[PDB]
């Protein structure tokens, strides 16, 4: 649970863009914890000497319970407002698991949006996150 940081102080995340197939239509968001009926795209803080790619797909597991093939780092995203500095990957899901971590642990959701509804629901209080699909 050891948070870490970029020289700058910023914290390091890494999430991915966890997407139905390799048409990229349809990503899988979670419920936010501090609020549940908001979404925001899984990820979290890299571990220790953790690859970014690695504290991503760890992270899509505990909080969205999927498993799938790795693709591209599409980019680094900084929240100036909140100092962090993520790296996101894209992730095709090729498992979906039950009773995964945050379902268990917090009641965490998931559900499945094409793109253009993932941008619009992201885009009141996780901006950020919704510039993560402008490429
Ligand atoms: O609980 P998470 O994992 O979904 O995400 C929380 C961040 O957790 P994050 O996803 O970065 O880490 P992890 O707990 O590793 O997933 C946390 O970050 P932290 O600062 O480390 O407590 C951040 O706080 P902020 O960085 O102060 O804006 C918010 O609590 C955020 O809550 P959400 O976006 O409403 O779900
Ligand atoms: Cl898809
Ligand atoms: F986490
Ligand atoms: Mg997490
Ligand atoms: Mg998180
Ligand atoms: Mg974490």
């Given at each position: 649970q050891t948070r870490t940081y970029d020289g700058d102080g910023y914290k390091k995340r890494a999430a991915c863009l966890?997407?139905?197939?390799?048409?990229?239509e349809e990503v899988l968001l979670v419920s936010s914890?501090?609020?549940?009926?908001r979404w925001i795209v899984p990820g979290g803080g890299m571990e220790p000497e953790e690859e970014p790619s690695v504290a991503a797909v760890r992270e899509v597991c505990e909080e969205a319970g999927v498993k799938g093939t790795l693709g591209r780092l599409v980019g680094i995203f900084e929240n100036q407002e909140r100092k962090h500095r993520t790296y996101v990957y894209v992730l095709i899901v090729t498992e979906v698991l039950e009773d995964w971590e945050d379902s268990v642990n917090i009641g965490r959701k998931r559900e499945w949006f094409k793109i253009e509804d993932a941008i619009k629901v992201l885009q009141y209080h996780k901006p950020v996150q919704a510039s993560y699909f402008e490429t």
């Amino acid at each position: 649970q050891t948070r870490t940081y970029d020289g700058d102080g910023y914290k390091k995340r890494a999430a991915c863009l966890c997407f139905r197939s390799e048409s990229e239509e349809e990503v899988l968001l979670v419920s936010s914890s501090r609020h549940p009926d908001r979404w925001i795209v899984p990820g979290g803080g890299m571990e220790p000497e953790e690859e970014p790619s690695v504290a991503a797909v760890r992270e899509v597991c505990e909080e969205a319970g999927v498993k799938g093939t790795l693709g591209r780092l599409v980019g680094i995203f900084e929240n100036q407002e909140r100092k962090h500095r993520t790296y996101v990957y894209v992730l095709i899901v090729t498992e979906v698991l039950e009773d995964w971590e945050d379902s268990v642990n917090i009641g965490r959701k998931r559900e499945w949006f094409k793109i253009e509804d993932a941008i619009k629901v992201l885009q009141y209080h996780k901006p950020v996150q919704a510039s993560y699909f402008e490429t």
